Amino acid sequence: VVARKLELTKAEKHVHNFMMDTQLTKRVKNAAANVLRETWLIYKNTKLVKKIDHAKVRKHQRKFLQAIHQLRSVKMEQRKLNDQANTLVDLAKTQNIMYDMISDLNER
Amino acid sequence: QQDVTSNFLGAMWLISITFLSIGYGDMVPNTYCGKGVCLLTGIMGAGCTALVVAVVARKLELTKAEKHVHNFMMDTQLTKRVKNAAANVLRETWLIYKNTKLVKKIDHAKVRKHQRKFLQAIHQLRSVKMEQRKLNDQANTLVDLAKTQNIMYDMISDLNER
Amino acid sequence: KLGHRRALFEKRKRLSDYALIFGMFGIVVMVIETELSWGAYDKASLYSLALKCLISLSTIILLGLIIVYHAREIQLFMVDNGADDWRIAMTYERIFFICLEILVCAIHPIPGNYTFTWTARLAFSYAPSTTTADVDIILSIPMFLRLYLIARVMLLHSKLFTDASSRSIGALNKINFNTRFVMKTLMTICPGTVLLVFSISLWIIAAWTVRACERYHDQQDVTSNFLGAMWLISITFLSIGYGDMVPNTYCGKGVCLLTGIMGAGCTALVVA
Amino acid sequence: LTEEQIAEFKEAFSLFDKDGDGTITTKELGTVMRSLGQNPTEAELQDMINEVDADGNGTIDFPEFLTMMARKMKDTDSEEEIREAFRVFDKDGNGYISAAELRHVMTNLGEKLTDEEVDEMIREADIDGDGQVNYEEFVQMMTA
Amino acid sequence: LTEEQIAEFKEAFSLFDKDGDGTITTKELGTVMRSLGQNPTEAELQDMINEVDADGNGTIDFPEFLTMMARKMKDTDSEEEIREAFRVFDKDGNGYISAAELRHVMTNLGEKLTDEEVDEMIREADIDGDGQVNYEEFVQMMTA
Amino acid sequence: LTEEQIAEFKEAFSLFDKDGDGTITTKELGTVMRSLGQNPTEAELQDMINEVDADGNGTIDFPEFLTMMARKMKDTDSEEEIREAFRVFDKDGNGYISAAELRHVMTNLGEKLTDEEVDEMIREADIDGDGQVNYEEFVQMMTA
Ligand SMILES: Cc1ccn(-c2nc(NC3CCC(F)(F)CC3)cc(N3CCOCC3)n2)n1
Ligand SMILES: Cc1ccn(-c2nc(NC3CCC(F)(F)CC3)cc(N3CCOCC3)n2)n1
């Protein structure tokens, strides 16, 4: 009984997906912004400065990998949602429409 | 008075083995308050066990992207055995024919050994082919239908229109 | 660069094999020493030192091998990610795990002779008991934590998770070959073997551990009996009960709790 | 390159070929992917082999295969990671980015910069001379 | 209105529009709803977009989008519920109900009234003059 | 053949021929397969009929399948198994194998022979005069 009652209904999933997507869209942008910032700042500190301070360059090269990993993880989480979101589409709803269209095409 | 159930660690152990439904050990409450608390713990544990049973069956299943690689690995591993088995059966057939026809004197121990290995070769080939069929017909069942149905609907609509 | 990568892989694998060989020897010698000390010879004999110096030497060599292995893997990281300085690879998580490995692998019963006072409350009768114990009992049992090297050796020696083409296809599909993936794969290829090996191994290990703990405060030979411990572990794993056998020490109760939790997990898995 | 790796590639390189003709086919790949449980579209199947080619014939062979297998086996390549994180903020998809949303995101969206750094970044990468910033040219220039 | 609400509404309006043009398309809505897991029909999408609109064409913008957000946050204890209450007993979709149907329903179906109240209600609702009661006018008369 | 054996297969045949015709067609078999949960294609049905075809006719009667029976209960057949063993290494499907491939597989795959045995086998198999060996006749020669 508990396994029967655990799951949500259709109308609840239809809004759960909306909330999840709305949350994920923000993180997929924060991660990209951090990646771009780290790349630019590395290039500036390694080329434009007359002298070179290696501790700062090393710290920025360390943060670059963190940014890349976070972006990749968030994109994977975003991909996982669509696979279970598109499995809720019924078949008997469009089956009748396709059958009627095929019948009309055959008749005329 | 003897410091059994008034011991903090004794109460911890009692609650742990009452939640999990193992028993009571030497530790029984002397008051109805203890028995009430133990009953509450037992009911909560009985519910939580079923919830964990439901959870594990969902958390121990591969996602689609992992299936797409699992199938590739399994197929590229089975293709080798389906060839080793055939090599062995062909070898045994050739040796049987050679030792039974192209010789002056017939030695029967060798012929019997080769006829014995022939059947094992046949059985191994059959088993490997069965595993390959099982993999194929268990793998070709996770293809979605919404995209293909939409494509067919659009094609039917275009054909009806024109 | 392919040759350099191949050489690094081979060296890392060989170091892992040597580390496992040098850990199992120490565990076995500890088992023999604990068995024979309660009997033939006491702690003041020359055999005590003669058999603990072996343990200490094995520990030193094991620490050396682990450090060399970690240096090799840092070199491999530098090759893979395209870096020129090794300080880039040193984050907080890496340092924490290296220190944890060193600390876990650097425990053993040191040579010497020290004593300790142990008070326990007897079961089913609530009568106190006082003895004098050995400090080696607190230092010897934590040595079973070394068993995590078997996982590393098996994962590194597996041909199914090593082919270059499979790694390339997985990279194209944007998935990672971590330990969760391999565990999920073996839980589908063959779950019976996985659930059987772990059960038997934990069975003997915990049955010996309870006896080694509880032989001190036991006089009537109940929980210091090997078969009694085996029966106790069997009926605690399956949640039938305790019979008339309860540990007299908190070590026994901890071991029994671990057994019970593992048993509930295994029962759910077998249900699936 | 060790001979063992070459043989390991040639095995499962002989895959995707149901006739053993020593060449690739846009239908053999479809059959293989159907066998593994997928079913991509014709355009996607074309793009899969289009993204790695150097002759324009629409057919690759052992050299290109080994070329792609050389990569796709290491860790972070530090090039695709910056290839993305632009398309996230790139809407139309032609390959140009306006010079105002860049300032907005760099000043607002997470671990924000300051005005001096953003102004310096905009002053740099001014090859185009217009508001439309070419991010592809900014790559291979800031990371050459 | 606190600027946080406006910012949230603008962030939500950024959805349904994967073009950056600031204009809701009857195909963009279909794509979004397909992403969420639904496949409405073209007529259903047309009705959904035509339920609220200001200009003649099927175009909704942020000024045309923030109108009903305020209404949908409250509890619709208004004439909206009476609309479905009337429509339950309304067989055809024209919107007219016969008087005898009201008599029978009010006098028989649940916490029944007394015939005096029903006669008074019919006399007060004698706006049609024929017997084909228009419930919209009655709704406006009752709720004002 | 015992009386019980003769009376056997009669219920199965009646199940196949649910018309009283006395002969088995290519449509009743399709109906039976659909009943049991399978939906084979027309080519597969034709091939299944052909594999038990009496001489040339596209129909099966009661004397036809008695020949097939009492053969599908003999376990090892020692000919069909060698047939699939040859077909595994046969790529195109015409029914011919190159000699070099045979040498390679016999000297490399599985339990391996030595060059003397392989050379002797090829010399004894030189009943072709060319690279193609025509294993079909070789099967008859080997199995005697
Ligand atoms: C399971 C499997 C087997 C192959 N897979 C696969 N192949 C891809 N392309 C290659 C191009 C060179 C080639 F000769 F090898 C032919 C195929 C691309 C690709 N991708 C990238 C796009 O998102 C989906 C995964 N997957 N996946
Ligand atoms: C999950 C999801 C996302 C959107 N959903 C949704 N949108 C509706 N219309 C909107 C009104 C505001 C607008 F500006 F966005 C134009 C389109 C109507 C609607 N309904 C009412 C009819 O019964 C089905 C649910 N659902 N549902």
Q: Do B139 and D34 touch (CB under 8 A)?
A: no
Q: How many domains does chain D have?
A: 2
Cα gap C176→B143, rounded to integer Å: 23
Cα gap D48→D27, rounded to integer Å: 12
Same domain (yes/no): F66, F109: no
Q: CA–CA distance from B154 to each of A94, B148, B161, C85 (Å)?
A: 11, 10, 10, 58
Q: What domain range includes position D107? A: 86-142
Cα gap F99→C122, rounded to integer Å: 83
Same domain (yes/no): F9, F78: yes
Cα gap D88→B74, rounded to integer Å: 36
Cα gap F44→F23, rounded to integer Å: 19
Same domain (yes/no): E12, E66: yes
Cα gap C117→C134, rounded to integer Å: 9
Beta-carbon contacts of residue F110 (< 8 Å; ≥ 6 apart): B83, B84, B85, B86, B87, B88, B91
Residue B95: name the closest of B103, B105, B104, B84 by CA.
B103
Backbone angles phi, psi at D132, to 5 degrees: -70, 105
Same domain (yes/no): D48, D80: yes
Same domain (yes/no): F80, F90: no
Same domain (yes/no): D94, D80: no
- Contact residues of B toward C, CB < 8 A: 2-4, 9, 13, 16-17, 20-23, 25-26, 49, 52-53, 56-57, 60, 62, 65-66, 68-70, 72-73, 76-77
CATH number of the CATH domain containing E112: 1.10.238.10
Of the residues F68, F85, F102, the one at which a domain ends:
F85
Buried b (16+ CB within 10 A) or exposed e, D25-61: eeebbbebbebbbbeeeeeebeeebeeeeeeeeeebe
Same domain (yes/no): D18, D63: yes
* Whole-number CA gyration radius for chain B: 33
Cα gap E58→E50, rounded to integer Å: 7
Same domain (yes/no): D1, D70: yes
Q: Yes or no: say if B21 and B42 are a contact pair by the CB < 8 Å rule.
A: yes
B82, B87, B94 ranked by CB distance to F105: nearest = B87
Contacts of C184 in chain B (CB under 8 A): 60, 62, 66
Q: Yes or no: say if D71 and A25 are a contact pair by the CB < 8 Å rule.
A: no
Backbone angles phi, psi at E98, to 5 degrees: -70, 145
- The DSSP string of chain E is --HHHHHHHHHHHHTT-TTSSS---HHHHHHHHHHHT----HHHHHHHHHHS-SSSSS---HHHHSHHHHHHTS---SHHHHHHHHHHT--SSS-EEEHHHHHHHHHHSSS---HHHHHHHHHHTTTSSSSEEEHHHHHHHH--
Beta-carbon contacts of residue B153 (< 8 Å; ≥ 6 apart): A94, A97, A98, A101
Same domain (yes/no): E47, E94: no
Same domain (yes/no): F69, F17: yes
Q: What is the resolution of this structure in A?
A: 3.0
Same domain (yes/no): D80, D92: no
- DSSP-derived secondary structure letter, B141: T
Tokens (6 digits) for C188:
């589908």
Cα gap C86→C84, rounded to integer Å: 7
Same domain (yes/no): F45, F96: no
Cβ–Cβ contact C39 with D under 8 A: no
- The DSSP string of D14-42 is S-S-SS--SS--TTHHHHHHHHTT----H
Tokens (6 digits) for A77:
């989480």
Helices C250-271 and B8-19 sit at what angle, rounded to 10 degrees? 20
Q: Within 13 Å and on the Cβ side, how many CA atoms surround B134? A: 9
Cβ–Cβ contact F65 with B under 8 A: no
Give the helix ranges, DSSP H, for chain F.
Answer: 3-7, 10-16, 28-36, 42-50, 62-68, 80-89, 99-108, 115-124, 135-143
Element (H, E) at C120: strand C115-121
Of the residues E66, E85, E104, the one at which a domain ends:
E85
Backbone angles phi, psi at F53, to 5 degrees: -60, 130
Beta-carbon contacts of residue D53 (< 8 Å; ≥ 6 apart): D60, D64
Which bin fits D73, alpha (ψ -120 to 50), beta or left (φ > 0)?
alpha
